Amino acid sequence: KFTYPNARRDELVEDYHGTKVTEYYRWLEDPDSEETKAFVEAQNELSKPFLDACPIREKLSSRITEVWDYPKYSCPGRHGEYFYYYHNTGLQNQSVLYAQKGLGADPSVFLDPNSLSEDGTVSLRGTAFSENDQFFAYGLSKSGSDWVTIKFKKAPSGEDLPDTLERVKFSSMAWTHDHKGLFYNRYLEQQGKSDGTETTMNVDQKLFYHRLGTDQSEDVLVAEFPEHPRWMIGAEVSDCGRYLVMTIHEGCDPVNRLYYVDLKSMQNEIRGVLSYVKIVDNFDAEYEYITNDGSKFTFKTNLNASRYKLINIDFADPDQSNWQTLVDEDEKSVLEWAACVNKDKLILCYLKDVKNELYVHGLSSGSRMSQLPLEVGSVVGYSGKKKYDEIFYQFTSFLTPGIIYRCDMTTDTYTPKTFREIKVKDFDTSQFETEQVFFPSKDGTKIPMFIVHRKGLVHDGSHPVMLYGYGGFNISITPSFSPSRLVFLQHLGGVYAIANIRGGGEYGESWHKAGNCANKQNVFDDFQSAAQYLIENKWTSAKRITINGGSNGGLLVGACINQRPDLFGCAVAQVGVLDMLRFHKFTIGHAWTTDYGSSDSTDDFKVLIKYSPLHNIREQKDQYPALLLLTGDHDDRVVPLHSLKFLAQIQYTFKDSDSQTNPLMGRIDTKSGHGFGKPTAKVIEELTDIYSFMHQTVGLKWSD
Template identity: 30%
Template sequence: MMKQLTTGLLIMTIAATAQNDPFQWLEEVDSEKAMAWVEQQNADTLNVLTNYPKYKAVYEKTLEILNSQERIAYPGIRDGYYYNFWQDAEYPRGVWRRTTPTEYAKKNPEWEVMLDVAELAEKENEKWSYKGVDVLAPDFDVALVKLSRGGGDAVVVREFDMHKKAFIENGFKLDEAKTRVSWLDRDTLLVGTDFGEGSLTSSGYPRQVKKWKRGTPLSEAELIFEGESSDVSVGAYVQRTAERNYVMVYRGISFYESKYRAYENGKLIPLDIPLTADLSGIFKNHLLVTPKKEWNVAGKTIAAGSLVALDYEALLKGKHAVSILFQPSEKDSLGDVSSTENQLIVRIFKGGRFDEFERHTFSNGKWAAEKIDAPEFGTLSVVSADDYSDRFFFTHESALRARALYFSEKPESEIVKMKSMPEFFDPSGFEVKLHEAVSKDGTKIPYSIVFPKSGKMDGSTPTLLYGYGGFEVSLRPFYSPVMGSTWLANGGAFAVANIRGGGEFGPAWHEAARKENKQKSYDDFIAVSEDLIKHGYASPETLGIQGGSNGGLLVGAVTMQRPDLFRAVVCEVPLLDMKRYHKLLAGASWMAEYGDPDNPDEWAYIKKYSPYQKLSKDRKYPEIFFKTTTRDDRVHPGHARKMAAKMAAMGHPVFYFENTEGGHGAGVTNEQRAQSTAISYVYLLKMLSK
């Protein structure tokens, strides 16, 4: 058993309430006292886990995979080049680079470096992390580069010369903030950022959109739109197509409600679409809309989760000319929507098990659809699609099939396999099994498990169950060379639960476990855990669980409710103190998912599962491994800090690790990610292996 956390905490009172929390000082992210606590916990945890016999091999294998030159360099199509962001041993903080299509087709293409982030970090003495780029089309000669200190969501923005491969000295620059920015034209930006007092929402995001002209101070930018301080965020974006440009201004009233306005000829025009609808862009002068609730419009009843195309010009006049492109069934739901110049690529999630692509085209006033001849029985993901041609790249993978990259030149062309990831572990010794558990209210909950063919159905196999269950996020089959090489190869099994709160079966699957129904996510996960034990895959002594962010809340909640089911818990970048979550960083933006703790009626159901409040001195819990990062400016690291400290003060041993970089993730460099990943798997091996 590892050394107990922070001896000084052991003598502190544990009678914490929402009004009198003795661990609230740990919310002071960078305070000397809090960071001293973090350093001590990191030292204690690393002392145990890095000295575990298998740590060195697990870490080295993980880093080898993360730095491997055989990984796929995923391309972004822009103006005759393929762009890529790449990290390896030579470029620890990564390089933004490009190559030609001809060169990319080679096994080892030559790349032209546009920006070396480590070089910039050393020059400016900043721990820069690359956060993306917006290149101005169709000339593609200037760009807005986004950089984060330590990997957080807040970024600085700088204008970049694509020909000189250098920042423009007197170009556009924005200070660090959770900025939303888009090119209106070469000399004008649409900006939402921290303009000063009153310019941010209670969630810490912009509540104003301004038009900023080149050569003028930001303070003189013209206000285009302003939302309310209680909104989640306000922003604007420009979609460029071969036909014309479209400008949208949005007001995010809540996480699931937004009001959209078109910005045409300097005027804002409200769009008559449901507040709960999602937009998937504009294609052939049609606005692509997915209503999250049944929508009666233009004499049609459109099911929630459908994809509809609205004639844009008619919509500007307040009229609805509606074409239904996809309607969900009981098991088939809508996935991502991407577009090239002349085709929509629509991903359909089939039965919660695998994906298909549909191609939709619009010609001579009519829509047509056909299935795309993509590989079957796996997960499909569009990597890049070109707005100025019909080229697009996509990947295919499954739990035991390595990811491969495919290329489509145009609809009538044969799809070509361009690259493939090597099999970093031998999949032949494993099989995927599909099951359904029955939740507390009788709902059938699908889950899958990758299990050794030689494994005994006597509960002896170390088994890791992963879940999320929130924000309509779907968990789809994926190939993880690291997990396969370090967990499966060491005798483990891996299961994924498709619980309610996710989006695997459309909006209703999510809605079933939101706010006052959130407990259903936890009931579902418990049911899957019990089913794994019932089938003999695992036992309470060999079952571990893992989740991050909302998934961290998930594993925290079920551990408080059913600690007897689990031997190991990896709780990453979690929400845990649900009494204060809305007061910490972006937490207020999630009240549409969880509810408002300051509302007595809503706190009445939140407090029933909030892990920080449910923790008891008198119950026996597994030794939970809490993980977070100091620079997470989305989910406050105080959640993990306080929970670990409170458990330690109650006499419950825990593990704790906090990376000082990484944002809402595991690190910025591959070395940081490798360490974070390795200590998680070593913890699981230590706790679950006999």
């Protein structure tokens, strides 16, 4: 009974290695045409009244906002005599950066991003203080785009400097220790727009050096690789300031080349393309800089260690035969990151069965000295420089918004203190609990899954489920706090489940490879097996399951509704990649071929054509679940044409279907992008729409 917008069908046939593939809505790849703008407007004019028609929408938005309304803080970061920290009073669109001369001093406002936009659509993206704590570089993104403008302030006053760097994207921000400038990345001029609404592919990223007090036109091009247009040059200055560490990536695999430049030994100042020394001239393994003592550098690596380890490479004898293991690879746990504090102490964060653990090691020997206790959850923030003598770290979990710890690092015992407790106001979290189960996938592999629910739940199959997943790009989906999840559990009788499906990094690179490239179908099988597990164990039934995912998780949702529509009642795919044959042709999509492959390859196409959601919409005996696609017109990470073309094709496929009664809709937001830096007001509106859509499609019941 749903009337879907008109969408002109333009038969476009293309040959992929002998296989003819036809699509009908490629005109939606042009975001600037009147036809595409009319399609976007018509889809919003259909979904907005349907979402607003939810009878509990006001109650839902009010409760999400009330649960969300609590003071939030980042860890305090020391920079000289001043500490800097982000703080949100509760519902501010963007967090404010404060400065205080000591932990006990009254703070001053250092940078309020809310002062730059009436609707909070200007957000910070990347920050870096100078080594002498006197200057502060920061990136600004408009309307959620990946494009960045780098600006500068004096610290701690916050007074603006005139320096402005444009066309910055996916950029480093590394000050030289002479406090005279920094390294950053930018793209040269391109045809058309560069504001987040274009689909133009980004290649030939350059590394530049900007000197303070000069125009950007005077910046020195220090590194470029025109023979490898997809290479991206990460730049970092060593802790002592002597070395420029160049980490070169191609794609999204946890691997990188490792070059360096001895800045101090340079005969002259930075004036041209820098001559570098190659330490690792391949993409075989990761080499992530931790610290260095003179010429001996400590790196985190996955070289012959899928669960990661720490090695030492001395630039004075850099052949691989001289490398030494500093911290052995753990037999079970994944080493997520390491940080050096107080000259010769290391903070190592591990992931053990999708739960974070923290340990203190010695830099000289790599030997373990202590464990910092944590509850079941994730470490989402850290502060602790090599030159300072204490650390701060932020912990979060499903029922814990935040705990900020402080640990003195000057003694041989490491007893962390609670610095801040971040809690929801007037909410009894003791009524709920989290369980971790391991369910067998289609091939028999055991997959971890967190299930958050009310205590005393009986397994009668009556409870609605929000099933979340991602599955790809070495990303581990670890416990975190969500205010809307609390409302779902408290007022909508909900059960929330995360399936740690393959493709992620929960169990190392082998877990990642088991769900990428030719093994991508394993990811979808794991997620479908998660829904089957919840049904078989009577947590829920298929009609009560809502699946949700974003970006690569949006691809997960799209493939799962095509393959097993009988397993779900609702589906919410946010900013999802849905045309798997053309994703690599837009913006930064070429970097994802390390997990997806590319339709340019004959072998990769045979894999992609089987699960590309846009090309696998088929009516089955069971109707498709209710579908809500969410994207923004400035999502230049995953261009919104993915959602637009999928929406047009799925609405056409079921236009004459008697059996399809569930709605297939989409919401295209304005002045927002992939998600990072989205203002709080838009986030709450989006969560209200998600649970309003579920209430209208899977029969949720509101309880006050």
